[PDB]
Design a protein around this nucleic acid. Structure first.
Ligand SMILES: CC[C@H]1OC(=O)[C@H](C)[C@@H](O[C@@H]2C[C@@](C)(OC)[C@@H](O)[C@H](C)O2)[C@H](C)[C@@H](O[C@@H]2O[C@H](C)C[C@H](N(C)C)[C@H]2O)[C@@](C)(O)C[C@@H](C)C(=O)[C@H](C)[C@@H](O)[C@@]1(C)O
Lengths: 51, 49, 103
RNA sequence: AGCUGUAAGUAAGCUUUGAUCCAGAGAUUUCCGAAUGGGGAAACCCAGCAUGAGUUAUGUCAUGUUAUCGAUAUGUGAAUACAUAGCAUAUCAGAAGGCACACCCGGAGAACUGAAACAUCUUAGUACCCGGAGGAAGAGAAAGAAAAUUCGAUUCCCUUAGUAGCGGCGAGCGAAAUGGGAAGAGCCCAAACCAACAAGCUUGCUUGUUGGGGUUGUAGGACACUCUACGGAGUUACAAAGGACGACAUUAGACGAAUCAUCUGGAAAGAUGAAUCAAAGAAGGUAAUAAUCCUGUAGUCGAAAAUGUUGUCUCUCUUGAGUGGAUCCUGAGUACGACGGAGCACGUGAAAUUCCGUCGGAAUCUGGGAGGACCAUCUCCUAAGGCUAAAUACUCUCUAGUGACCGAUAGUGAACCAGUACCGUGAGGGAAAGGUGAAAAGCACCCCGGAAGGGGAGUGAAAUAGAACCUGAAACCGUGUGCUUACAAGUAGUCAGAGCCCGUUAAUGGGUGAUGGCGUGCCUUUUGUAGAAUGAACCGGCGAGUUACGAUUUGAUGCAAGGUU
RNA sequence: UGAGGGUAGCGGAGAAAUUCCAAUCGAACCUGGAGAUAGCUGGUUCUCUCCGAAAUAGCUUUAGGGCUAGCCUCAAGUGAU
RNA sequence: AUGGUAGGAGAGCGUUCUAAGGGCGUUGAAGCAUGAUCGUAAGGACAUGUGGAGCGCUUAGAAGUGAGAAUGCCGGUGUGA
RNA sequence: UCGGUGAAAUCAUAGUACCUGUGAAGAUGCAGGUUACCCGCGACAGGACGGAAAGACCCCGUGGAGCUUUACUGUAGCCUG
């Protein structure tokens, strides 16, 4: 949704994985990925700010 | 500064000075009465002899 | 990181699996030398105080990355950490306790 | 726990009593050079004064001192009498020179050029020169900008706008207000007036010294009128805690997880297989391509010069005194004007506005200035006194880093012996030149030879990797051979074609060529070039429509009476 | 004829020749403005496909340059002209 | 229908680099040399020798993107002999 | 001539004949004929419009410079107020 330093630090060192905020989404790191896991809150946030 | 131009009737320009009207007079500097240069406009009401 | 009077194993080279004792280190280019390891064959000429001499077989240096200490308990190859004791610093094995080495 | 610079090891040695090294502090620091005892052809010569060593004595040597201007304290005193000039001492070290002249402020100030010539204009207040200071400088608190019902001292950014305007109305030059924003700070003098101090004067007044007081307009202050001060507390100017002041960056520094085996190999980090760590899969080395071998990384713990300069921070602060303003004060050779000039977007003239020189030369609150000649009514302001942080400009430098930047004719002129060999009397100009190998294991020994060179042997994975050392192209120079050539006229090839030799990316193949036919190179410039018109000795390398900003027009996409920051 | 010195480029020196001022002078040399300007000359790098000129009026301090028209090409449109 | 210089339009080949994906390499990469191979062209593969560590392919994107000529610059090397 | 040492200008490639013609109007290279075994050395100078020097004569450039004057425009300076 906004920021989780713990999950960011957990996923930082894995290859292929990237971590982003709903506000900080970008087309490049969306399209480079093959899958997209969201939290429900982040999904609702992007839904409201893009709808 | 004291620099500018002299202009012709065809407005040709040449560099030129404007010199002050210095006069040598004996004034009373701090100490003795010294003979020194000074302008007429200056000694008009600016200094005594 | 090691010292002069240690017993170690060679990981990389023509000699690998071999053990040996270290006899010099040369830290400013990180190339130690070990007995029975990396043997040259120098052509010797007549020096001022010796005969001509044929070939000469002595040791040559070897990079430190190609050498590892041995756990004194298990005699297995192990890295080395550090432990502070009363302001003094000692070497540990990362699998067991202390490793004693003075010569 | 090794060490005795880059540049190597011998001989000598030093080192756990803590060396070499890494930061901080201190001592020493020859000579020249602003160079400063005098001189001088820089890195040299020649002195003196006072101490000290030595000397029977000098000689010699050593240690300090001896420049010019200036500041602070003194006496002094010629043509001519005290006085001062001037001169002579004691103390201090205040300046000089060099700036990074990149940025900033002043003084002085071009020409090529464009206008398709050229002179007003432009290039351009540019380049260069000189002087100043500084880490910033400059500007700065309305005698304003504007005409709303107004506004925030200065500076900077975006717009206004290539507009308004200037202009041989040509080339071209080119604002401002308004608005949106960054940063946001108003403080002190002179004069009135009051109270003391000394001299003239007779202490009445004046002069000057000190201290308060107050520095602003729909008028402020003094006198006239009226009742309050550390409440707040602010060192970026305007006063200050100088304060226990509570991580400089917490900076040198220290710790810092996790891998084994087999195959090929000269050597594996590679392939195969099985495991592990991850707040660490950034990067670089290691005999080849490594998250788990090394240095390291994330992260944690950390001390001197230190404090982050940050939080109540002792003292000290500013808890305001409101009305009329009637009288007094409110910056003089000033404002302003004429003449000649310059700067303002403005071409010198109606110059309104702001500066220089020469001549003149005022008003004082019922005053004065501005509002693009000038007059009147209205609006705004109150000059001729000063200081002022921030936002802003540049980088010889430093620390930490980054790149659809170069990779040895590139990129700095310079990856190495660089502003060096070299050239020039001198100012100045100014190169070429990188790569053995993992490891020096850098070829013991034998043979030819005066040696250089080589042939063996040997090291090595490799020696057509041997220091003229990675790869090793072409021009050029050679040695061998298969086909061919001494009756022949030639842009040297092309189409045809026997004979001879070979045998491929195996397909109606390759090499040579007795003989026949056709046939005057390339480029540029030209009406037209084989051209006796140009250019090229050959080979290699380098070597020319690009980028920014704006306009216009096509294509694409999004939205659409709206579109866009 | 020697040794020390002096005169410097909008200048100097010249028994005068445009003569000399570091192998150069009708205005020295080095740096900078400066990548001056050049309506002039030379050069300007890979391939195929489609179309395909002009060397002419007119104005020009203009004549080996330039502007507009003519003639070329590409794309839309009108649509018998 | 398809000759073509100034010139206009169009479609393509190669070079260096970047992103992503997917690959090749000491059982030997790029470079160099040879060849009787493929493609309408620019040009692309394969095989063998040499060499001894990096390099292709697909799609897109950026350019210091292609030399035989400039009395061109720098190096090597000839001719005259 | 022999022994030692050993350059340079120039140079599109070259197996580089003559006559009469042709042609950018003066040909080793073109046409038609004539002649001519391959390769050197010593000599000569008719041609290669030979080499050398982006013609200095001539014209052009809205290119420069030097000098002249009753060319235009200015000016240091001089005279007078
Ligand atoms: C000694 C040393 C010199 O000898 C000469 O000067 C000879 C003596 C000239 O004779 C002549 C002699 C004299 C009478 O001329 C015939 C005179 O008129 C000219 C000026 O110099 C020559 C040949 C000239 O040629 C002629 O120059 C003329 C301008 C055009 C003429 N053209 C027909 C092709 C051409 O051949 C021209 C200028 O010198 C040659 C240039 C390259 C030189 O300056 C060369 C390098 C000289 O330094 C030279 C070698 O050193």
């Amino acid at each position: 949704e906004n920021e989780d330093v713990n999950v960011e630090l957990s996923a930082r060192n894995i290859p292929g994985v990237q971590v982003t905020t709903a506000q900080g989404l970008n087309v490049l790191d969306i399209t480079n990925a093959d899958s997209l896991v969201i939290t429900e809150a982040a999904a609702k946030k992007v839904e409201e700010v893009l709808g | 500064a004291s620099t500018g131009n002299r202009r012709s009737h065809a407005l040709n320009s040449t560099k030129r000075r404007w010199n002050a009207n210095l006069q040598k007079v004996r004034i009373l500097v701090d100490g003795k009465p010294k003979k020194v240069w000074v302008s007429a406009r200056a000694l008009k009401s600016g200094k005594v002899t | 990181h090691i010292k002069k009077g240690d017993n170690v194993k060679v990981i990389a080279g023509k000699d690998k699996g071999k053990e040996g004792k270290v006899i010099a280190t040369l830290p400013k280019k990180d190339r130690v030398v070990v007995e029975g390891v990396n043997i040259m064959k120098k052509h010797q000429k007549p020096t001022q105080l010796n005969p001509e001499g044929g070939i000469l077989e002595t040791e040559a240096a070897i990079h430190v990355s190609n050498v590892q200490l041995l756990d004194p308990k298990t005699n297995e190859p192990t890295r080395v950490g550090y432990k502070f004791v009363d302001g003094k610093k000692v070497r540990i094995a990362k699998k067991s306790g202390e490793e004693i080495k003075s010569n």
